[PDB]
């Protein structure tokens, strides 16, 4: 092989690997329990469903019948 080119890809590997060694270690530090996951809309199902059944017999405030 050509000694000049062989010795040059050798430099690109290291320069690229010393400065490339940071990206993957950031994923390993990602929290498994995200910040405020219960805030995520998928977890607030009852907050959006229950108002739709708030007038259903069986879960009404007793005074709602007296005024309606």
Decide if residue 4 touches other proteins (CB under 8 A): no
| Total residues in contact with other proteins, by rule CB under 8 A | 44
Is residue 48 within 8 A of residue 42, CB to CB? The reply is no
Tokens 């690229």 sit at which residue? 16
Decide if residue 24 touches other proteins (CB under 8 A): yes
Choose among 54, 35, 36: nearest CA to 46: 54
Q: Between residue 46 and residue 65, which ones bind other proteins under the rule CB under 8 A?
A: 46, 48-49, 52, 57-58, 62-63, 65
CB of 59 to other proteins, least distance (A): 9
Three-state DSSP class for residue 60: coil
């Amino acid at each position: 092989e050509n000694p000049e080119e062989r010795d040059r890809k050798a430099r690109e590997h290291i320069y690229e690997m010393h400065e490339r060694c940071k990206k993957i270690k950031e994923m390993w530090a990602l929290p498994i329990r995200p910040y405020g996951f219960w805030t995520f809309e998928r977890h607030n199902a009852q907050l959006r469903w229950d108002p739709q059944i708030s007038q259903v017999a069986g879960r009404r405030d007793p005074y709602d019948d007296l005024l309606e």
